[PDB]
Amino acid sequence: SIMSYNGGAVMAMKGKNCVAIAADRRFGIQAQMVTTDFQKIFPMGDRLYIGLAGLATDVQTVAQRLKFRLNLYELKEGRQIKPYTLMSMVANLLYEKRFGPYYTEPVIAGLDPKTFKPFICSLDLIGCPMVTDDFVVSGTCAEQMYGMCESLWEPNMDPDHLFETISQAMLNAVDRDAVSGMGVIVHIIEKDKITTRTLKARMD
Amino acid sequence: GTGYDLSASTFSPDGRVFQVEYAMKAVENSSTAIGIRCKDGVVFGVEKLVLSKLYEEGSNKRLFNVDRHVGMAVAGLLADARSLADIAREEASNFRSNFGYNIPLKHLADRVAMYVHAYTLYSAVRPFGCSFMLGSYSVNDGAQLYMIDPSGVSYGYWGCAIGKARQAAKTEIEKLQMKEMTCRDIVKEVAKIIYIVHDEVKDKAFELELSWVGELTNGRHEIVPKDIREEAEKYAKESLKE
Amino acid sequence: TTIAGLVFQDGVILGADTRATNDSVVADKSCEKIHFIAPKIYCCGAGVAADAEMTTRMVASKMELHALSTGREPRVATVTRILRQTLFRYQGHVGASLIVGGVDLTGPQLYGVHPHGSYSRLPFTALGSGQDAALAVLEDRFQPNMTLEAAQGLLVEAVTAGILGDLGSGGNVDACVITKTGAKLLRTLSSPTEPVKRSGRYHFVPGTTAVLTQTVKPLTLEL
Amino acid sequence: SRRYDSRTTIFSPEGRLYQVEYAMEAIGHAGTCLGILANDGVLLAAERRNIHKLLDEVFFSEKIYKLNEDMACSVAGITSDANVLTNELRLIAQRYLLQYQEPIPCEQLVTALCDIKQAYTQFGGKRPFGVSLLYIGWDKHYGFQLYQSDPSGNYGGWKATCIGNNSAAAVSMLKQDYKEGEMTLKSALALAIKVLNKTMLSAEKVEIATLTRENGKTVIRVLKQKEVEQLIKKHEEEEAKAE
Amino acid sequence: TTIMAVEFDGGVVMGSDSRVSAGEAVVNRVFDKLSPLHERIYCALSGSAADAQAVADMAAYQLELHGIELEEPPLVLAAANVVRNISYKYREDLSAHLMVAGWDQREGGQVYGTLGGMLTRQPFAIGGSGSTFIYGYVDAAYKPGMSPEECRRFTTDAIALAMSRDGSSGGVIYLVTITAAGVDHRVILGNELPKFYDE
Amino acid sequence: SSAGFDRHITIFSPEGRLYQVEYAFKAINQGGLTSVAVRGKDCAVIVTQKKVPDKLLDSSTVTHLFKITENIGCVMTGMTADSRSQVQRARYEAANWKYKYGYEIPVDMLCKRIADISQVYTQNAEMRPLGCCMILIGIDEEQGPQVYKCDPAGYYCGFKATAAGVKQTESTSFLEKKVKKKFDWTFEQTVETAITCLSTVLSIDFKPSEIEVGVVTVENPKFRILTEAEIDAHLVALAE
Amino acid sequence: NQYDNDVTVWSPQGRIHQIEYAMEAVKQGSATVGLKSKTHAVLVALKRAQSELAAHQKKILHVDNHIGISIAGLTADARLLCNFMRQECLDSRFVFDRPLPVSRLVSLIGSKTQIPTQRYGRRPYGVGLLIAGYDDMGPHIFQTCPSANYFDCRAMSIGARSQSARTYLERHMSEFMECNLNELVKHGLRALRETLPAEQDLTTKNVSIGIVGKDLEFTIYDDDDVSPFLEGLEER
Amino acid sequence: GYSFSLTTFSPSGKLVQIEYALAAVAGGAPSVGIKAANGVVLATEKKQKSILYDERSVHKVEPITKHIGLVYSGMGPDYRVLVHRARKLAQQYYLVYQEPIPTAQLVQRVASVMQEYTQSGGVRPFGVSLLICGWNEGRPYLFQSDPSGAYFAWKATAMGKNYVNGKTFLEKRYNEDLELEDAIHTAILTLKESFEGQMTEDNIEVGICNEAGFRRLTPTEVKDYLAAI
Ligand SMILES: *[B]([O])([O])[C]([C]C1=[C]OC2=[C][C]=[C][C]=C12)[N]C(=O)[C]1[C][C]2[C][C][C]1O2
Ligand code: NA
Ligand code: NA
Numbered sequence A: 001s002i003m004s005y006n007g008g009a010v011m012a013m014k015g016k017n018c019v020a021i022a023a024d025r026r027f028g029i030q031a032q033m034v035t036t037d038f039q040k041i042f043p044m045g046d047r048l049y050i051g052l053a054g055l056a057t058d059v060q061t062v063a064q065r066l067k068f069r070l071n072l073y074e075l076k077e078g079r080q081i082k083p084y085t086l087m088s089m090v091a092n093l094l095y096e097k098r099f100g101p102y103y104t105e106p107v108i109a110g111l112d113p114k115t116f117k118p119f120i121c122s123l124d125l126i127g128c129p130m131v132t133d134d135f136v137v138s139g140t141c142a143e144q145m146y147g148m149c150e151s152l153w154e155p156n157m158d159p160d161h162l163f164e165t166i167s168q169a170m171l172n173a174v175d176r177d178a179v180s181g182m183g184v185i186v187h188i189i190e191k192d193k194i195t196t197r198t199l200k201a202r203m204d
Numbered sequence B: 001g002t003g004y005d006l007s008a009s010t011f012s013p014d015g016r017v018f019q020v021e022y023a024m025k026a027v028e029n030s031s032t033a034i035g036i037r038c039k040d041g042v043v044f045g046v047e048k049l050v051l052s053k054l055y056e057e058g059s060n061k062r063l064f065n066v067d068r069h070v071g072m073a074v075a076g077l078l079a080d081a082r083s084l085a086d087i088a089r090e091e092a093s094n095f096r097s098n099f100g101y102n103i104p105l106k107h108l109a110d111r112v113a114m115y116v117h118a119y120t121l122y123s124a125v126r127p128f129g130c131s132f133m134l135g136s137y138s139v140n141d142g143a144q145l146y147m148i149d150p151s152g153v154s155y156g157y158w159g160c161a162i163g164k165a166r167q168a169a170k171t172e173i174e175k176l177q178m179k180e181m182t183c184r185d186i187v188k189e190v191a192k193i194i195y196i197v198h199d200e201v202k203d204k205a206f207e208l209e210l211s212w213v214g215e216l217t218n219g220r221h222e223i224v225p226k227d228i229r230e231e232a233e234k235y236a237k238e239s240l241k242e
Numbered sequence C: 001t002t003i004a005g006l007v008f009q010d011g012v013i014l015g016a017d018t019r020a021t022n023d024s025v026v027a028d029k030s031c032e033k034i035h036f037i038a039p040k041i042y043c044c045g046a047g048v049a050a051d052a053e054m055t056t057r058m059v060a061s062k063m064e065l066h067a068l069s070t071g072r073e074p075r076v077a078t079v080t081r082i083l084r085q086t087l088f089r090y091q092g093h094v095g096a097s098l099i100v101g102g103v104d105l106t107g108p109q110l111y112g113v114h115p116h117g118s119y120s121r122l123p124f125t126a127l128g129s130g131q132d133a134a135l136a137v138l139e140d141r142f143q144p145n146m147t148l149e150a151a152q153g154l155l156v157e158a159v160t161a162g163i164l165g166d167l168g169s170g171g172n173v174d175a176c177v178i179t180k181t182g183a184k185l186l187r188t189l190s191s192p193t194e195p196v197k198r199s200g201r202y203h204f205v206p207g208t209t210a211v212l213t214q215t216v217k218p219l220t221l222e223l
Numbered sequence D: 001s002r003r004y005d006s007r008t009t010i011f012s013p014e015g016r017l018y019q020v021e022y023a024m025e026a027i028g029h030a031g032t033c034l035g036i037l038a039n040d041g042v043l044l045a046a047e048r049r050n051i052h053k054l055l056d057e058v059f060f061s062e063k064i065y066k067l068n069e070d071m072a073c074s075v076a077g078i079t080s081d082a083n084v085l086t087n088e089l090r091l092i093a094q095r096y097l098l099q100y101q102e103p104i105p106c107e108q109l110v111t112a113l114c115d116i117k118q119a120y121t122q123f124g125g126k127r128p129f130g131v132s133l134l135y136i137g138w139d140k141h142y143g144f145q146l147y148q149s150d151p152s153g154n155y156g157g158w159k160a161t162c163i164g165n166n167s168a169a170a171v172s173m174l175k176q177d178y179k180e181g182e183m184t185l186k187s188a189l190a191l192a193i194k195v196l197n198k199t200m201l202s203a204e205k206v207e208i209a210t211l212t213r214e215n216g217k218t219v220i221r222v223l224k225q226k227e228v229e230q231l232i233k234k235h236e237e238e239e240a241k242a243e
Numbered sequence E: 001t002t003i004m005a006v007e008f009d010g011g012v013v014m015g016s017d018s019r020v021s022a023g024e025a026v027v028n029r030v031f032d033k034l035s036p037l038h039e040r041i042y043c044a045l046s047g048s049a050a051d052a053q054a055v056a057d058m059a060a061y062q063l064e065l066h067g068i069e070l071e072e073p074p075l076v077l078a079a080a081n082v083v084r085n086i087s088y089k090y091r092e093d094l095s096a097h098l099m100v101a102g103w104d105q106r107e108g109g110q111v112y113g114t115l116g117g118m119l120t121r122q123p124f125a126i127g128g129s130g131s132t133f134i135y136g137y138v139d140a141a142y143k144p145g146m147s148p149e150e151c152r153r154f155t156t157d158a159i160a161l162a163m164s165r166d167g168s169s170g171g172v173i174y175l176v177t178i179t180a181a182g183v184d185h186r187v188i189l190g191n192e193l194p195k196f197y198d199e
Numbered sequence F: 001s002s003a004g005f006d007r008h009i010t011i012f013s014p015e016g017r018l019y020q021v022e023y024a025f026k027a028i029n030q031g032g033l034t035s036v037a038v039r040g041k042d043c044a045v046i047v048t049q050k051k052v053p054d055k056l057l058d059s060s061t062v063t064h065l066f067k068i069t070e071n072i073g074c075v076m077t078g079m080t081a082d083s084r085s086q087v088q089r090a091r092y093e094a095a096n097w098k099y100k101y102g103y104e105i106p107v108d109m110l111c112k113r114i115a116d117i118s119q120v121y122t123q124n125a126e127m128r129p130l131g132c133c134m135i136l137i138g139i140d141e142e143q144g145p146q147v148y149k150c151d152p153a154g155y156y157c158g159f160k161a162t163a164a165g166v167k168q169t170e171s172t173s174f175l176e177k178k179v180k181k182k183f184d185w186t187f188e189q190t191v192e193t194a195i196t197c198l199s200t201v202l203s204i205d206f207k208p209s210e211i212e213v214g215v216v217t218v219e220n221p222k223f224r225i226l227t228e229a230e231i232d233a234h235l236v237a238l239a240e
Numbered sequence G: 001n002q003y004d005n006d007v008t009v010w011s012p013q014g015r016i017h018q019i020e021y022a023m024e025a026v027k028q029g030s031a032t033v034g035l036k037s038k039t040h041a042v043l044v045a046l047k048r049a050q051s052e053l054a055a056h057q058k059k060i061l062h063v064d065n066h067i068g069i070s071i072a073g074l075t076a077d078a079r080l081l082c083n084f085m086r087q088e089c090l091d092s093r094f095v096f097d098r099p100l101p102v103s104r105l106v107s108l109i110g111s112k113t114q115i116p117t118q119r120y121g122r123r124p125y126g127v128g129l130l131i132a133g134y135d136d137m138g139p140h141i142f143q144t145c146p147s148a149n150y151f152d153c154r155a156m157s158i159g160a161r162s163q164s165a166r167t168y169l170e171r172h173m174s175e176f177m178e179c180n181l182n183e184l185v186k187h188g189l190r191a192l193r194e195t196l197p198a199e200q201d202l203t204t205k206n207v208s209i210g211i212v213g214k215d216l217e218f219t220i221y222d223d224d225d226v227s228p229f230l231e232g233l234e235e236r
Numbered sequence H: 001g002y003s004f005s006l007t008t009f010s011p012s013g014k015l016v017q018i019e020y021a022l023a024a025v026a027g028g029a030p031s032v033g034i035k036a037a038n039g040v041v042l043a044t045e046k047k048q049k050s051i052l053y054d055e056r057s058v059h060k061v062e063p064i065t066k067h068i069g070l071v072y073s074g075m076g077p078d079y080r081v082l083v084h085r086a087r088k089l090a091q092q093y094y095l096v097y098q099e100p101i102p103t104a105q106l107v108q109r110v111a112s113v114m115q116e117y118t119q120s121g122g123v124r125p126f127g128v129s130l131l132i133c134g135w136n137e138g139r140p141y142l143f144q145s146d147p148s149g150a151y152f153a154w155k156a157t158a159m160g161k162n163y164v165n166g167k168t169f170l171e172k173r174y175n176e177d178l179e180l181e182d183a184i185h186t187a188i189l190t191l192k193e194s195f196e197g198q199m200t201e202d203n204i205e206v207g208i209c210n211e212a213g214f215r216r217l218t219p220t221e222v223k224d225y226l227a228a229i
């Protein structure tokens, strides 16, 4: 499979007035680990982040081409993009290659730059958007993440409660996936601040 | 009118397109051609002035076969006329490829007239210096005679004349009750009218060109055979004396 | 997916389930499959989710331009034509199976549009993986000129047969009742599966996750 | 058709490009626009021509355009032509960043747009863009920079320059009081207020923007009405002390 | 599908079954496969539904503009060549067989086959998956000089016979009678079908 | 006032006029004919001069009334070939509309479309506007009988009654006085008004072969061209 | 003049001056004669030398085994039109395996050369040809002109002072069809001579001969090959 | 086609074809725009040469989308080109961002089209000035876009015949805190200043824009406003 060539896991989770976004840190080609610090989560605003798993080259191309369109947008519009608008912008980008797609399945997490209400979503490789009020997952361990998320997720978690839930859902999911891991990075997005943490994770 | 007369994409202050009127002047300055619709077909006659005795008989023909059932008679700039015969031929051929039968003459005239019209709208091209007639005969359609001018106008006729003696040939055609006459009798009258409008003083010599399409030819457009042409030329010269 | 449609006495009723599956794994428990085209024209989508999303979006957009220019309420046959001719050009590669239902100056109409560009006008229809369950319920009890309440009941039963019988279908029943006086969007008209609650006492004491690195970036300076 | 052809990209007998020269004449009619380079920043101070009681203030500025994270510009000429060019400057900057994953060095962004303006004067048969631009920016190669470009597609880097209405008068006034290497944006702001006061003073008719470096990040800001008024009164009070 | 067209003195009769099937699934059991190309010209659709509908629509559009430029209703031969040229130009990408029949003031009632881009005028013609089982029947039952009612009866019996043997044909029978007078559309319901041996 | 090429091509004059568009309106009158279109309670009728000065012409081919669709007909005034080109375009646009949208093009939409095509000639310099005027009639399913007109300028509008050609100003001055009076606009009243509008304006007592009449009714919405006998029927009624 | 610089511009008299100016190019070039008998088509030409130290410009060109041409006008336009004729002939032998009927090739020249006379920025071909050929309809002499018009001829002459040659050809027209090849070439040479002033005469340097017929493929005779045809008559 | 510009700089640095296009706008029928606190009004003189004109067939006040509207002064046929293009541009924005186009964004995209016609080969500029109204953040928007491709945000403005006097009349009657119903009244008053004849609900056209969107006022609503005049 093309999606399992590099591997990786990305997940987003909604809390009470906050959102979380997490990813593994492995860069590997098939069974060979190459790098243990590969960036998969890219900031698209002060309170808006995109998580990209799948084929490494396309994770980098989609993030770069999305940043291009976003910069032109905020320059023309003279305002920070809304989470839903960034989702539509990713959908258009991905669907433009409907018959030769980028091998990536995005996850978006943020707070509205005016309403501060949490937003989470995901898109398939050809840009079909899916908004949820709990969690979204993408990666080679989507079954593992769905099991962890379905069991651990609770409705109005405080930043610290959310941090523990997303951390345990990622850690335990990627530890049953051969081609995901080498560490986990988590971003907790609040109205007042962004907390970034790397976890003590398995290195095998 | 000077200034407003160099381009077909320019109207003069009084709402006229002079480049089209100047193209019509080239038709008026040309020799006369006539076409008469009768009870069983259409007959064409052309006053074909001989520019030199060195040219062969039949050179610079002004009568064309545009389709097996359609004939064309021209007046004006001859290269433009031949170019229009090729457009009409290709148009008739295209209809057969699309629908599987012979193009109806009114449709062929409408189609060709719109190519002509297209050359009256822009500075990129010039209007055709040509006026032509299309004649046909079908059992379902009857006899049909159309005439297209440099502007792109197409009309159906009973009698028609284009060129130098356009009005002179018209008053002679009006003297015929062609609706109740046959192609065989009308050929005599066509040659007669050409011999009347010819200018012996201004033009040293001319050759008569005769075409026809009717019940006699089985809807085919063809030349009037040498014998029937000689009989029409003898009758035209004999009626010129008396 | 189980999407169904039905023509009754005073209009049309469109029905859909709310599950999106990613190869035997339920990704979305609550997705909207009934799309807006025009105020009195709606469309149920099945097939490739992105293709159904973008084709409905495209025709709603073309229909707004059509209505703005004409100054008239749009026709159901126009959305059928536009959809048909766009799908035909793509030779089935745009995997949109659509149920177009609506009300125009000629009354209620219902159409089935397939990915290849073929269509049919019908009194009732069903599409998606759960189409045969819905179609069995419609064939069993459809009668022409049904009352709104009788037709809504038949539609909920037809979509429910697909939800329970088809593995690729689930969640809730969404419906859209289109009449001469507009459209009433009944989001979650029925939930065949009642809240499946549990003793989900899964709480982690703060500090159970071992952290190696921490960085706090404040945003109060911008606020 | 040769009769109607204006012949915009041809030479005059003195080796002159008349459409370019006629475009320069238009720039003279547009609002005064100046730029001053200092050791701690750069500035653009421009005369506002959209002054009217019934005009609504919907945009951050009138003549100041952010181009990229480290650059901004100001224009003088046909405003619609300036909107075309400023949009293209943003595309060029995004294309550079997509390619190298670094911001476009200031001079490179200027030369790129200038090559497009130059093309309009050599081929195509089209009229040139009737715009002169002043660019302010920062980069890791030359730091704080000021540039000027003309309809000809010609450019130069400057310590202080002026485009638009009374440009020559403002340039000689700048030539007198600019001290090379000893300018701070506090002293450059006072020089901008002084030059504009003669070549035109109220905050309603002025528009100032600064480009500074704060914590390894570029800060581009247009001054508030309260801020501009402090600079106007500080100039008025400096003349009141001379009397 | 089972489609059929018969010429008579003064017009044509066209018939079709009503089943649209995706393999073993009947997707539409009441589909009318007789489409008007003009006032007195119809076509019978078979093969790929998407292709058949696309060709029928382009032919109807081409023929409408043709009829207006010519100031007369198109000839059935012009309709036959319009469909045939499309089917032939795109024979590798199209998989439909559109039988074209109707009436003219010039040639009257005529039936044309456009199978794979060819063109043939026939006294009667049959098409579709169901036509296979009724070749012997139409050869044994066809008689020259049939009246409009005898043609309808023949088309109905032949199509009912195919509908009973062919899994891909079924439903009701749609009939269309085109004459100088106009067109008569008729439906023979699945319960009112003519009965024959069926064991 | 003129500056440069503003009298030769479609560019603004110092007053903001398009001289070339103004000259295209003068080209309509070059034909010497006048047309009238009147809308009624249940119908819409068009009438124009039919001048066949030569017995040598086939009078059946001399017309200014054209069928665009089964239910839409028009009268053309102005330059003949330009008019036949515009009718051809109208026929194409109407057929193309039904192909893409699956319903018949409304009269206002066909008129708007022709007007939009004409506006291009008004803005692009390489070509001239058509020296012709199109008046379309038809019955709208929701809105009733319709009379629409478009210009060499690209303007278009719907009307209660309208005119074109040499006596447009005189025919509109007649029609606006007749529309102001109390009338129950029957088919007979709409047809007579159009005939006696053209007759009073040209100061001519018409003969059947001297005019041509086209009509659309809610009872029979197909565009119908009147025969010499049917025209004569209305002419002898006006003699009384 | 305002109706002088473009082929798309008709003058108020119904004239295209640019076509009439292109016609002049033919009149400026040296004279060439073309005539025919029942079996042969002959082309005779006056080759003009720019100096005593320069050779005499090629006036006769080979098109196909059954066709040859004589030129008068712009030589680059003559070369362009000759190359067109050669290709049209080649295509006919490739597709039909049969020589292209001469009258059909002349029709193609007429269509091809008419195109630039109706398009803006384009110009007429400034060349006139005399075409000798032989096909199922026997020998032929055709004339093509910058105006795009073409003529079927019994005989013809074009170029500088060619009216003199036409006067001779009009008189002896009656003899041509029964002449033997030597008698026919002689008639062409005498017509060519008439254009020349009374001082100069036809030499083996300024004479070119082209012949095609029932038994002869298109052959060009130029210097020593011209000598046999020259010896016969030398009076006037 | 003609590939050279028809608009060029004069020796005095003027784009004379854009100045002549502005004269076409100046000769056009009056148009007024007033941005009230809770909405926007667009009013125009829809005066027809005769009674024979079917008044409800064609419109001057046109919707672009559910929340954007337009009016103009100058060339009617040129206007229709810009309306079609503006409606199209608004749909492209909606397909990509799934959110109604901000008024300023639509104005900018339509101004670009207008600028093209001042530089592109073989075309003259539009002889139209547009007045675009909209509602998007939580506020009303009124913009003017002129033949050169330049745009301006306005609190209130006039265009066409007697526009300089209409703007002075608006200058003294504008209050930033106006209600939409009060702005409609003073918009009809601005038109009355230059209107020649008796103003009825059939020879004037009004369009409004608020949190509910953009719509035209019916002749019955226009009659009720004229009742207080
Ligand atoms: B027949 O040959 O079995 C039939 C023709 C048919 C049925 O429905 C239509 C609709 C429009 C035109 C033709 C037509 N074919 C089918 O029913 C099949 C179902 C679907 C998959 C192949 C083909 O189209
Ligand atoms: Na996913
Ligand atoms: Na792992």
Ligand code: NA
Binding pocket: A203, A204
């Ligand atoms: Na390992």
Ligand code: NA
Binding pocket: E162, E163, E164, E165, E166, E167, E168, E169, E170
């Ligand atoms: Na069966």
Ligand code: NA
Binding pocket: F009, F010, F121, F122, F123, F124, F125, F126, F127, F128, F129
């Ligand atoms: Na023009």
